[PDB]
JSON list of C-alpha atoms in Angstrom, two decimals:
[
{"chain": "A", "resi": 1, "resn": "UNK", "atom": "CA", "xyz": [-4.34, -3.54, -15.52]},
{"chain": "A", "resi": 2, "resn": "UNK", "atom": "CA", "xyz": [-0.55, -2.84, -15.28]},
{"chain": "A", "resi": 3, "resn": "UNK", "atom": "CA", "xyz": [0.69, -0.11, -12.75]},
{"chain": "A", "resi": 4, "resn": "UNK", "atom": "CA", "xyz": [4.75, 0.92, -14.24]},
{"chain": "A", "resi": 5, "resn": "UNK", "atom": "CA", "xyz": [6.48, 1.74, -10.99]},
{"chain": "A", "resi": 6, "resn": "UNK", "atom": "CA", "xyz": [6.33, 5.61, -10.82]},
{"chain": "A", "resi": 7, "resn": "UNK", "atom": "CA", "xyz": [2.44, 4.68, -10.43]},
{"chain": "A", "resi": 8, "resn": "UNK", "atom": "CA", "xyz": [3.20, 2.13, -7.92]},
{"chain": "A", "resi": 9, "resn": "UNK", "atom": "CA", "xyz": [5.13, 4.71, -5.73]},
{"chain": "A", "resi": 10, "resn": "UNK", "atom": "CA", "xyz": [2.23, 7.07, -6.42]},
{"chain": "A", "resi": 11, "resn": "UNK", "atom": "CA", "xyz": [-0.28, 4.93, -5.37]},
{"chain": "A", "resi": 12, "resn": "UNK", "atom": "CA", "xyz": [1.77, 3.86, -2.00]},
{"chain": "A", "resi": 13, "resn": "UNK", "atom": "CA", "xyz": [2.72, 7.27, -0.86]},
{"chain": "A", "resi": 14, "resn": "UNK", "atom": "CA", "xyz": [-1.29, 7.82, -1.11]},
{"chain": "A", "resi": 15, "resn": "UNK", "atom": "CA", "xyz": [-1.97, 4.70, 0.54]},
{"chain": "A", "resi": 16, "resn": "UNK", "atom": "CA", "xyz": [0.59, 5.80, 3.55]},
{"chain": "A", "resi": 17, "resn": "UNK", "atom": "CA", "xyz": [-0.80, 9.42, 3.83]},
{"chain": "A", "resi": 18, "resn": "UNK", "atom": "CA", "xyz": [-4.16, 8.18, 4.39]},
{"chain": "A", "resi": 19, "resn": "UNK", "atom": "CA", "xyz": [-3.51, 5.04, 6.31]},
{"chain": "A", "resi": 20, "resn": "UNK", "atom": "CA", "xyz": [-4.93, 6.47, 9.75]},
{"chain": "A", "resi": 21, "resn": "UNK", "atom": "CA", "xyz": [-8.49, 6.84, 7.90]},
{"chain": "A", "resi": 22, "resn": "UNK", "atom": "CA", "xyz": [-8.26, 2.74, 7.10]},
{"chain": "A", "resi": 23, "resn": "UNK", "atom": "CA", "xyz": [-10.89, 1.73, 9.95]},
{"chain": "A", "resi": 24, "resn": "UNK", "atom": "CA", "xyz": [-11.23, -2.00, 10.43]},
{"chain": "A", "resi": 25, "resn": "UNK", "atom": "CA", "xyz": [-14.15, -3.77, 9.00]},
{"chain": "A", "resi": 26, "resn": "UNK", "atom": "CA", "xyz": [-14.35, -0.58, 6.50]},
{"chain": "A", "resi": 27, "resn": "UNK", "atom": "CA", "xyz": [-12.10, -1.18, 3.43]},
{"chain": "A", "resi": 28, "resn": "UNK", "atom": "CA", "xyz": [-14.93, 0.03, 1.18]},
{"chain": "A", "resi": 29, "resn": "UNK", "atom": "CA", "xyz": [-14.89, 3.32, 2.21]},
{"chain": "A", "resi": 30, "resn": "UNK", "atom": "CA", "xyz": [-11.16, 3.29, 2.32]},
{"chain": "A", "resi": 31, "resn": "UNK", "atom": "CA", "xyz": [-10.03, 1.77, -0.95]},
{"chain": "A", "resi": 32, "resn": "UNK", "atom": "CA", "xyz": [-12.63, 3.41, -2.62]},
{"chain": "A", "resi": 33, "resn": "UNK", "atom": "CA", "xyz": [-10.97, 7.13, -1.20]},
{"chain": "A", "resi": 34, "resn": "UNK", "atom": "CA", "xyz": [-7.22, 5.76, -2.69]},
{"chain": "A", "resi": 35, "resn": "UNK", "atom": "CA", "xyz": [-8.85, 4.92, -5.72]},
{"chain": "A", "resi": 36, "resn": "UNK", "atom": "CA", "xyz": [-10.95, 8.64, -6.16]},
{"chain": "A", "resi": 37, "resn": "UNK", "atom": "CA", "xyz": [-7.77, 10.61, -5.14]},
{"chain": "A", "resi": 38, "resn": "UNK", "atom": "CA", "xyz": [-5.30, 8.55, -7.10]},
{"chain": "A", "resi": 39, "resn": "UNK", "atom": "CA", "xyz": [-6.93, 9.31, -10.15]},
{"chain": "A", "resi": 40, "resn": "UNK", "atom": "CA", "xyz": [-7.82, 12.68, -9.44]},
{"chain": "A", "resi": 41, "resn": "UNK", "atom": "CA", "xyz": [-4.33, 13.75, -8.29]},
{"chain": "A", "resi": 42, "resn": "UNK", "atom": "CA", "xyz": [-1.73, 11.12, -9.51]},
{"chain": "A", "resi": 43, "resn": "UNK", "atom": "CA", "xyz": [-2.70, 10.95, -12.67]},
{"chain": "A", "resi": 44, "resn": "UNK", "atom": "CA", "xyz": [-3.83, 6.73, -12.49]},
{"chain": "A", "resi": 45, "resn": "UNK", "atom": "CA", "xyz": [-6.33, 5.20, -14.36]},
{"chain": "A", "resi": 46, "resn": "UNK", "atom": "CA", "xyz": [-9.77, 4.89, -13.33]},
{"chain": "A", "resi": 47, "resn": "UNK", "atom": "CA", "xyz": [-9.86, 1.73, -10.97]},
{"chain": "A", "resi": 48, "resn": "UNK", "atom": "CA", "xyz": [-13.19, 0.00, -9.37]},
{"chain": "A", "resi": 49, "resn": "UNK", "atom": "CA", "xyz": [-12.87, -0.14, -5.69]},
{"chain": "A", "resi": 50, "resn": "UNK", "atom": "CA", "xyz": [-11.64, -3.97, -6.33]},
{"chain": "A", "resi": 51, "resn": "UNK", "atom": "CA", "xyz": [-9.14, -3.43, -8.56]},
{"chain": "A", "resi": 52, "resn": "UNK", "atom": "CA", "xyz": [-7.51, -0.56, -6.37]},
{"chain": "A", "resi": 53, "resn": "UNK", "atom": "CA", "xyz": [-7.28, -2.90, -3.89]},
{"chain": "A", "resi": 54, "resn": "UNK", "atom": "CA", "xyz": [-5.78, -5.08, -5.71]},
{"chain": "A", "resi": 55, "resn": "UNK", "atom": "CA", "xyz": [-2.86, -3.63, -6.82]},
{"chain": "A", "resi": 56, "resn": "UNK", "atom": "CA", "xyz": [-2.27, -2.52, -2.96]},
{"chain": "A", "resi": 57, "resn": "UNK", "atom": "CA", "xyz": [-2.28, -6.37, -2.28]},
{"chain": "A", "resi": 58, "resn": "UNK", "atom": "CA", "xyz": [-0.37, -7.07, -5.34]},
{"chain": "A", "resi": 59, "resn": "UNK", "atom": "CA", "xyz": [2.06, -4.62, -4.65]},
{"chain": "A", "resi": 60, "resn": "UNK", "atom": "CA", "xyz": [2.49, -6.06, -1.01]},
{"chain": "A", "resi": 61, "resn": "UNK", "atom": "CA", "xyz": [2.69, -9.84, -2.08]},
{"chain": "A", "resi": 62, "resn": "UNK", "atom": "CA", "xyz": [5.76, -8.51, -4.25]},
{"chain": "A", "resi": 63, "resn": "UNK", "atom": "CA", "xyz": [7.64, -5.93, -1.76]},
{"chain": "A", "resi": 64, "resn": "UNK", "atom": "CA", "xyz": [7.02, -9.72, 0.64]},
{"chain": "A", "resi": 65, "resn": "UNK", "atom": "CA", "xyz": [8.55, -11.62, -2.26]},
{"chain": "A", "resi": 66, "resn": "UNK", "atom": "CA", "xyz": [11.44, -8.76, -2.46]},
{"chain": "A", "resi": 67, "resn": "UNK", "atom": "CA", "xyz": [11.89, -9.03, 1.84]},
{"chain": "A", "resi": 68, "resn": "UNK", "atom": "CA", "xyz": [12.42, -12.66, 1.43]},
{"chain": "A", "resi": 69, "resn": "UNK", "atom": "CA", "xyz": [15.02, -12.76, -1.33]},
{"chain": "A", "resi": 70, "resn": "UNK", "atom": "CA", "xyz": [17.41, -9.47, -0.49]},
{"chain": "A", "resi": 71, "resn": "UNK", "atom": "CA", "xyz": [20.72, -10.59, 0.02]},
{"chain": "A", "resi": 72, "resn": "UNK", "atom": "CA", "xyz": [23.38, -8.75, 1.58]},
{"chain": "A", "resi": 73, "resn": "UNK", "atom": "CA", "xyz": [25.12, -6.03, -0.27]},
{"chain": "A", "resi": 74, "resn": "UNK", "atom": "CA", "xyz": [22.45, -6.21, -3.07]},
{"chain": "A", "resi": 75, "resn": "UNK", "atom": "CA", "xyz": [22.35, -2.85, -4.80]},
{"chain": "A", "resi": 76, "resn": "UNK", "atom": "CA", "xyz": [19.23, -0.32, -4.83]},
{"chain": "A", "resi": 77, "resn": "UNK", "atom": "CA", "xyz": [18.05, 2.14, -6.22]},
{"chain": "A", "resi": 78, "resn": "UNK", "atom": "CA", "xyz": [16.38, 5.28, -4.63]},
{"chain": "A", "resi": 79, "resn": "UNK", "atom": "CA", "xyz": [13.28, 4.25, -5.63]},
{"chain": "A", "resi": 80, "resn": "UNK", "atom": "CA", "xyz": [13.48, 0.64, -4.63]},
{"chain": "A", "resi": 81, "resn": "UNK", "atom": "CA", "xyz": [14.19, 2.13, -1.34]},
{"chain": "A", "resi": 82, "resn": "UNK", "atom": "CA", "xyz": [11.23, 4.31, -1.43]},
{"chain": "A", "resi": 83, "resn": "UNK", "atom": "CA", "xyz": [8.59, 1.46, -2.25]},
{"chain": "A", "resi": 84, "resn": "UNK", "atom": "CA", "xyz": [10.22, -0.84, 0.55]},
{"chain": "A", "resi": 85, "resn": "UNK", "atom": "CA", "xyz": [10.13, 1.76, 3.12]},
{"chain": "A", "resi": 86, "resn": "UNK", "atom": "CA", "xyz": [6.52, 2.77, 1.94]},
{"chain": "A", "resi": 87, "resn": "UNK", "atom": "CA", "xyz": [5.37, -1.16, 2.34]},
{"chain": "A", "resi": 88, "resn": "UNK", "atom": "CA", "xyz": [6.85, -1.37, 5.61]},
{"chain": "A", "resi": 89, "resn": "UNK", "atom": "CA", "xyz": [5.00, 1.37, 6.79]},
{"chain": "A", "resi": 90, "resn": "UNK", "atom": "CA", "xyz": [1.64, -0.13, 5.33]},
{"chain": "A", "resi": 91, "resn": "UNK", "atom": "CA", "xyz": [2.65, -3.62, 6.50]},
{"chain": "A", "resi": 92, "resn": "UNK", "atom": "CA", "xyz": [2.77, -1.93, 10.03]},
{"chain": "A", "resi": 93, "resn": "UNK", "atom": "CA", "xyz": [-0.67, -0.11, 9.81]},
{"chain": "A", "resi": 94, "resn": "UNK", "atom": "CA", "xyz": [-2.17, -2.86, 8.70]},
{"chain": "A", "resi": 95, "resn": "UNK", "atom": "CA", "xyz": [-0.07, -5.22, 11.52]},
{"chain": "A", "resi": 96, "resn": "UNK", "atom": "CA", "xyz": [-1.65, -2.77, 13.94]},
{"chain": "A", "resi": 97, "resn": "UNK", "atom": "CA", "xyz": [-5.36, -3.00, 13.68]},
{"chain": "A", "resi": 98, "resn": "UNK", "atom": "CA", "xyz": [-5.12, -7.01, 13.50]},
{"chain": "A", "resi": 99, "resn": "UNK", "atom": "CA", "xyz": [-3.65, -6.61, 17.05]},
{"chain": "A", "resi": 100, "resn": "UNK", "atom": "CA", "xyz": [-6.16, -4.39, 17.70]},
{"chain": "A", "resi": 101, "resn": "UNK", "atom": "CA", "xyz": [-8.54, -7.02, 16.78]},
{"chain": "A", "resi": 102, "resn": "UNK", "atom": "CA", "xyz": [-7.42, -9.73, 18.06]},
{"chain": "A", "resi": 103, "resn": "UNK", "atom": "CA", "xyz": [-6.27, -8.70, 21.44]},
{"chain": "A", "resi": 104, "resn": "UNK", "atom": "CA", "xyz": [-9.17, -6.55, 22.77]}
]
């Protein structure tokens, strides 16, 4: 299914509350919690714990898309700059525990 972008912000503000109860090697339980209180709360559709995650990585492989091709003195809206600055926080969480991994 479709997310419009209101749900998209939805979704990632959720995602970014919650992203200190992501524990590596347990997505399950994660994605399945952004799923549960995304439609309980925000009003989204009913999503598997699959296809929640996949509109989290769907949503990322565009913001990466969107990162690549800004050009200076682009215009954007408020909630452009909401999503981006939502994704970048992700991004970071998720930047974080693959150190985590890797290094230790």
């Amino acid at each position: 299914t479709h997310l419009s972008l209101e749900e998209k912000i939805k979704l990632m503000r959720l995602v970014v509350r919650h992203k200190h109860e992501l524990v590596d090697r347990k997505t399950s339980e994660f994605y399945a919690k952004i799923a549960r209180i995304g439609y309980e709360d925000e009003g989204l559709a009913i999503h598997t714990e699959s296809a929640c995650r996949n509109q989290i990585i769907s949503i990322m492989r565009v913001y990466e898309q969107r990162l690549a091709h800004r050009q200076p003195g682009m215009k954007t809206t408020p909630e452009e700059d909401e999503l981006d600055q939502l994704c970048d926080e992700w991004k970071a969480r998720l930047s974080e525990l693959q150190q985590y991994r890797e290094k230790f």
